DNA sequence: GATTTTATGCCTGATTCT
DNA sequence: AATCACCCGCACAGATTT
DNA sequence: AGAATCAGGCATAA
DNA sequence: AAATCTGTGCGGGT
């Protein structure tokens, strides 16, 4: 039961799909090339063969049906990859965490019970899309989140957007595109370091001039610098926090740090912009970007959107207004799963030979793969816990950020 | 057909699943002891206006709204999560008030979704207190269309009171309930003195307190669990031996059973045990439990001894069980093993943060309202020139410009402002140019716009006096709000008052009895 | 225990069931052509604010709301009813816009409730036009808690354009689709001449027009059906023969199939026929329909001719079908057999009633608004005494009594008040005591309350002029509404304008082709 | 086979229930007296044996299970009513039209296949309640709509209701009850004949005196009555209606042709009034009631309701006020089906031997019942259509006027 | 309205191995 | 997650009996 | 006789 | 070799 077979009988032009969920499989059975394609829905999560016993594996339902459909034997002295039906196998699971878990279980089954199938290259992984964007005439699918951001950036700067500084210059595209890309890169770098320092502290530094530690020495201009920084922070503060500054000359180069009291009613000891911070390349690139992002706007300015105009006095307002304008005649659909798609979308996105997109699974080194399988999917709790803790957020602390 | 090696795919996929399950499904939060599903369910039930003294709603409506809006998962899991919170014999303090058939201790199951009805319980409104006054942060839902709270501004110590149980990838958590009055006494004792040891805390918190009211046997395991975070305890049923003389044949009566045990499976297990000649001296077995309470009757053989047969039941049957206490919770988004003092300290810090943010919000609102009330009083003090000017105004904008670009005489109202001086009620964002300078008020754009939307109905005496009274009380409110932020002692006094009020409202008695071996 | 004869009980119960089903489930209403389930579903979707230019809603929402509130029957029937209205190949003009897997022309399936989405279509808003202006009568639901319309105030001739099909106890109904433009032209022709004959109507209405665009083979049954109400027609597929020369090969290509025929069953039937040797001259059969149009390819042997096999296909397989036209509908709560002229007359009478009721409601609203504006204009011309009196009074109630106490001289705004057509702009319920008396105006209570809520922003010149402009426009509107109610000829002009606008908005082209034998 | 058997082995004190639906079956199994009561839930509508062939009856599952449960054989040369089980059989279907249809199908099966069981009186019909009414302490169940209306009428006059007309009269119970009951009867009489005349005309004719045909004449007497009625109707409107009139003579009596128009540009052109209507007894009883129902209310009139007084005219609004006062502390629930009832209610309302009510099925005439069964349940459409039309609303339009 | 087997970690009892 | 297995009326192939 | 191995149950997810 | 008999499906209900 639950197996829609193909008409092709030669085992060199057939394919097999393992769709997750009953409704997704039912939808896929409609829109498929019935000549040389087959379907086999999986109801939910399947057995873990690494922990389980051989007899319990044979007694189960899903794995028994899969073994029967493949046609090869099972276990030693019967397994024989020569008599293989459905020479190409495709997974095509959901696009969320549970889909990845089911994918890992299926990979464990295939590698542990049938090595030569994996090694010869008869296993493929499918990549269905996530977003669908329509703009009246243009209609296209977009995968994951990064490509959505790229599409949004391209559409926002699509036509017009001839920024006017004072009277009528014209950046005209690529310069504005480079500025936008660099600013977004710096924003992404800033977002991944909020643990160490406040966001506002990093945001304010771009507009203010360079610290210039080379000529600072002990001129006592650090007092004026920190005073100006604190005054600017407190002028437009809108969360009740207060800031103070402190300076000292414990070394040849005078050091300074702010003290911030925030809504939590607890005060951090300090956030010193020490030698490492000024010497770090992060501050250098921040100053490089801020050099072009000083008060370039004059007293009068505006953004020249297509058949539109609006006075502006900051880059963030211009970006927000352009994004808001670009999202007028745009419609987006986000798929929660494979059950949201009609058969035609499935055919033209995952099952069409001339426009699908898949990955081939291969093996690099056998011993490393075997050790990894035993460590993760085994039945020993402590190695798995240690491995998960090793790759936790502590090991995610990458100082490159580039 | 880009290639990809097996090891990288396996590692990335499994690590993604493990992290998501660890920090998104199983372990609870130390500050309020709720998994994400509980928080989302309570928030969804609050948004619809499903208060504790209103008509019920079908469970299907609430489940559908929760799935559609905030929680992108199935329906059976969410409905079972709702059902478990509405059973008296599961939680110490129920969070949902239900009507229908929500199962029973005998082993039954609840009805389908389109047949039960639910609303919030009275205590649940304490968990979501002061939610609208910018006390906690919000995060986007899955598709970036709504907002959900990061953590509820709870007022009950929910984690210890209701406990928890969960199974994650690589670790698990299991914490038993407690009594509310004891926990609040412990919190107050901690607030009095921060150097209190575990011995001081255990004086006010002797031990757990289950809903089914069994007996706890032994005391070393509780101390070990509270000291290190991991321990084991023994739960025993309350049984008695009764004899009515005459024939001299005694009987065993059972009134209460341990936590998380089914009655029907217990009875059938005892029946099977006596069938196979494994337990001697049991003649008859009956269940009289209905309405009044739980009563199980066991009639023993004539020549047997009640104590001998009874002591075999604890060792053999499920009338004695072992509970393994193991505390794991999220501190700052990462799992950790906690003991009692860490939990209490975390709760106190949470309360301090919430009170501070609420006070700041109220101060800002009071200052903003006082700013408009001053302008309205000044305008009403000199109505005749104002209307005379307005009558010759070509348009509203010209009238607003004329009002802004001139001073006004304070008149007889300035004396009131002599009480309000010293820059107490001036908003922070206001510039020094505006406001009273030399006995001549200066108006802004917003004040003029507020003056323009004044109704004739407020020209009578009573409406005139109401504004003055409101201003007079607002001054005292602003003074009190400043005083609370001006020192640390007043904050702790406010927290003490809140805890005492909660204890008086929602306190109750003890059920489980603790005995030595 | 009380005896009962079997005959009486059987007769009573079966007659009760029959009279419930005949007027309750199966037969449609003549005026709007909707069974009760369709009306209830559309009303429920309308009340939720589920318009045609907003985000979709899950089918569970609509089905659950309909079951809970209005329609007390099973959910499978309601969901199938919703699904049937979303298929382009079932209704000529779809009423529900869906997203998901709503089936294919093969008659495959539809996904469950949780895996689809729906909203109202653009045309579906023309059926429910002017529903809020008291144009149709409401009746209670099954438990005396809600209200449901008795009939939709439709603007499209839904019954003819969309058709119907139903089975009842002792009778049935079957009406095919039609084209919108032809039917609208027929209605317009009828309005200009009420004594038109069937031959006159059929010039503008040649015949049916199915969604699938087959060929109708005959012209004799259509006239009989339109003249007496019962008839029969033959639907024929579209196919042709093509020759490649070379070796004299022939192939048969099928593009368009009849109405209500499955492609998969047809293909398998032809396969079985060739397999059992019942059809001679067919070599191979293939399907090549892909995203652009329907194509079925049949290859014929070299010792056979295409025409003979084609005619054998027509006579044997389901490529040619018979359709029995049988028109039955409810007129005034009784079944009745009808022809074309009766349906058109019923639609026109429905439009007349709807327009008259809408006009009366608009007239009432205009009169009330003009009545309030008169009081506002009178009050604006006596500013100084009004403000003096309001200031002197201590309480709003005393001010209200003082305002109502004495008359007010009209002043310089009396030019427009007297220019009104005596009592054209006077509400009916207003007593003769109030209104413009001999040179003085008397204020009611509600007029005084409206005066008290006047803002200071209204004293500017532009605001003063806008009220007079609004009043002068309202007078013209009232005059036009009176003229519309007066004569019986303006009403037909209004109806003609509405029908022409609908034709321009939603017109389209013909699909099915009619030919002689 | 969903059959829950009882303990009593003697087939002379047992009972069997044929419940509709699965929810009702589960509840009945929950709440039964387990000693001598059995349950057999029915999935849905069952086969019709009048139209079905004999061979198809044995293949079906529902009728086969029913035959097995009863224990007797089926068909000639095997049926044996002596060896019977469950001497009492109870139907107990739902309280809506579908339940009645299923009841008719079951009766057809029993009468056609097992005549002796029906003739000896082994088939009963249950009768569960419809409405539940609660008033704090006093709660009860009410069956059918007529009982609910009678209960409402009785509760409307539950003490108090001392009608003070002018100075101090008092009907004091029975007189008021008779007046109210007769008025309700006349209202029902008006409602049944509502189709052929407007409601307003019938509601106003009772206020008018008798026609007084004795003094009728072609001039100066025919016009006064019609003019008075038209004037009394025109000055009482809320829907922009209009009443007009004309009269004519035919050498026998002077007849009226009143006309009325509302929300339509068409005109009925006639609502004739002649000797036919006055000769009817409906107008006689209406005038008899109207003789009592005159302007008895003086400038002062009130009803001394229990610590409540509502001095008003237009006694219909007084009746409305009395109804509202009656419903001040009344709660009503209407069961949707048998499923809504919990097991205790089902036990105590229908299944209790000492508090249930039922009906016993018996056959009066055999040939007439056979003809009726053939006419209704046969597979001939035309006789059934003719029978349904004959007993249509035309047969319900009985001109007895009483 | 009524349909069915898995992952994940920690505690117990019951049962099998040298 | 779509499917169980019957009621109602009309019209037409294919299969049996006179 | 005492280690090693096997099953079932508790709460949110396919 | 004409005349009966027998199944299949269309759309809202248990
Ligand atoms: C309908 C009801 C639930 O809720 C509503 C709704 N509902 C929705 O608005 C809704 C809810 C959920 C969805 N969800 C989805 O669209 C996705 C799509 C998708 C695609 N791919 N994956 N998922 N599906 C899921 O999330 C999902 C995922 C997994 C599932 N199962 C499994 O994994 C599974 C489980 C076990 C096994 C095993 N062994 C195997 C597999 C399942 N579902 C959409 N819409 C709305 C209104 C109501 C309502 O008001 N009713 C009501 C009020 C009052 C009254 C009255 O008066 O009596 C009457 C009525 C209601 O009750
Ligand atoms: Mg998912
Ligand atoms: Mg029912």
Residue numbers in the entry:
A (entry chain D), D (entry chain B): 405 to 806
B (entry chain C), C (entry chain A): 8 to 524
What does the study report here?
Initial analysis of collected cryo-EM data (Gyr–Mu217–Albi-1) converged with a consensus ensemble map consistent with a mixture of states in which Albi-1 occupied either the AA or the TG pocket with partial occupancy (AA and TG states). The compound also has the N-terminal MCA1 replaced by p-cyanobenzoic acid, resulting in a shortened molecule. As it was not sterically possible for these states to coexist in the same molecule, we used a masked three-dimensional (3D) classification to separate the data into three maps, representing the three binding modes. We refined models for AA and TG binding states separately, while the XT state density was not sufficient for unambiguous refinement. AA and TG maps also suffered from orientation bias and low number of particles; however, the density was sufficiently clear to allow unambiguous compound modelling. In both reported (AA and TG) Albi-1 models, the incorporated aza-histidine group was directed towards the catalytic Mg2+ ion at a 2.7 Å distance between the presumed metal-coordinated water and the N2 atom of the triazole. Further stabilization is provided by the larger isopropoxy group in residue 5 that can better occupy hydrophobic pockets at the dimer interface and the pyridine N9 atom of residue 2 orienting towards the phosphate of pTyr122 at a 3.4 Å distance. The observation that a shorter N-terminal p-cyanobenzoic acid of Albi-1 allowed it to occupy both the TG and AA pockets, along with the tolerance for hydroxy/methoxy groups in residue 6, prompted us to synthesize C-terminally truncated derivatives with the idea that two copies of shortened molecules could bind symmetrically and simultaneously to the gyrase homodimer. It seemed that the size of the N-terminal segment indeed controlled the positioning of the compound, with the larger N-terminal residues of albicidin and Albi-2 preventing intercalation into the smaller AA pocket.
